[PDB]
Amino acid sequence: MALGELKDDDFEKISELGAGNGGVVFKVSHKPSGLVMARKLIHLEIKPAIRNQIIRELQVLHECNSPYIVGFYGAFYSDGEISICMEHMDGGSLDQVLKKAGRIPEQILGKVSIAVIKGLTYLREKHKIMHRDVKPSNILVNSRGEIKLCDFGVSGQLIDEMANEFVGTRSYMSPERLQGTHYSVQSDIWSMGLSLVEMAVGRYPRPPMAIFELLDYIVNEPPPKLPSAVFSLEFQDFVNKCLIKNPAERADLKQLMVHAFIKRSDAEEVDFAGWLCSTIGL
Numbered sequence: 227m228a229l230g231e232l233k234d235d236d237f238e239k240i241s242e243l244g245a246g247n248g249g250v251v252f253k254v255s256h257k258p259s260g261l262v263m264a265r266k267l268i269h270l271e272i273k274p275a276i277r278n279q280i281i282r283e284l285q286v287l288h289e290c291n292s293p294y295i296v297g298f299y300g301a302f303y304s305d306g307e308i309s310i311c312m313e314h315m316d317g318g319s320l321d322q323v324l325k326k327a328g329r330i331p332e333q334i335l336g337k338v339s340i341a342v343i344k345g346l347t348y349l350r351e352k353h354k355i356m357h358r359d360v361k362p363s364n365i366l367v368n369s370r371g372e373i374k375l376c377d378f379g380v381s382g383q384l385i386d387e388m389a390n391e392f393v394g395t396r397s398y399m400s401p402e403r404l405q406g407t408h409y410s411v412q413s414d415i416w417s418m419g420l421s422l423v424e425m426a427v428g429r430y431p432r433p434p435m436a437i438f439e440l441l442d443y444i445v446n447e448p449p450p451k452l453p454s455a456v457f458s459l460e461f462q463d464f465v466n467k468c469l470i471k472n473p474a475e476r477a478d479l480k481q482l483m484v485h486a487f488i489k490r491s492d493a494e495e496v497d498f499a500g501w502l503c504s505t506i507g508l
């Protein structure tokens with residue numbers, strides 16, 4: 227196998243990259259191969275049986291091979307922290323980009339949609355894996371201008387171990403999913419639409435309100451919409467098609483891949499790498 231032998235003593239911290247909903251992430255050096263990697267440590271609290279299942283289930287990431295999916299190097303258990311080892315991405319996430327930029331322009335977001343559309347299609351068509359948490363911080367970028375999906379739900383047990391410590395991003399869930407319905411394919415698309423709006427407008431796009439009020443608001447009130455003057459009608463339409471509340475009527479990936487917004491975005495020359503430097507200074 228490419229590495230086979232992954233162990234704690236061989237990595238070497240280059241920096242903390244930050245903390246999320248259950249894991250902490252570092253840029254590391256992998257001494258024995260010279261590979262640069264991101265490494266996410268997740269503390270849990272579980273029987274060596276469960277722990278080792280999780281590590282077995284994660285091995286399926288070795289078979290994810292796509293330019294739109296962050297690359298997998300290995301996963302192992304150590305010092306009560308499970309390790310996911312992945313391609314490092316020197317841009318961080320669109321959520322870090324957004325904080326930096328204020329607001330991410332419609333054209334760059336066209337590039338983002340294409341990558342995301344294609345990321346999900348890959349996962350679903352090759353591996354039958356749903357993402358389950360599409361949101362700006364689970365979308366990564368690098369100086370080579372690339373845009374990739376991470377933190378998707380490969381492991382049914384890890385989802386499980388993560389669900390009864392967190393049902394984390396409640397605010398990004400689809401109305402059907404807040405209602406208790408099982409995860410649809412149609413949920414990733416909702417969450418995508420909502421992420422583009424958020425990056426387009428530069429803020430979580432819902433009236434400010436207390437969290438439990440938010441969850442009723444989402445099931446009960448209409449979906450968000452782009453400000454209808456500053457954004458092209460293609461983009462607005464795109465977004466609205468992702469955000470139909472009724473999952474039977476929401477657009478799917480086959481239909482979004484041929485949308486006027488995507489066609490148009492596809493033909494533009496957007497120097498995203500360059501913009502990333504302009505904006506995040508590498």
Ligand SMILES: Nc1ncnc2c1ncn2[C@@H]1O[C@H](COP(=O)(O)OP(=O)(O)CP(=O)(O)O)[C@@H](O)[C@H]1O
Nearest residue numbers: 243244245246247249251264313314315318319363
């Ligand atoms: N492969 C990678 N390369 C570079 N940075 C990464 C990375 N994977 C994660 N990060 C960054 O590390 C920080 C923490 O990641 P983490 O996934 O734990 O938090 P998050 O911000 O995505 C909330 P959640 O835990 O629900 O996904 C984030 O800024 C994330 O963008």
Ligand SMILES: O=C(c1ccc(F)c(F)c1Nc1ccc(I)cc1F)N1CC(O)([C@@H]2CCCCN2)C1
Nearest residue numbers: 247296310359377378379380381384385392394395
């Ligand atoms: O880190 C994860 C995550 C959750 C389930 C799972 F199977 C994973 F593999 C996870 N990590 C992961 C997957 C693919 C790659 I390439 C690299 C990875 F590190 N999550 C889900 C998450 O976004 C949080 C968990 C709490 C609920 C909301 N989302 C963070």
Ligand SMILES: [Mg+2]
Nearest residue numbers: 246363364377
């Ligand atoms: Mg994440």
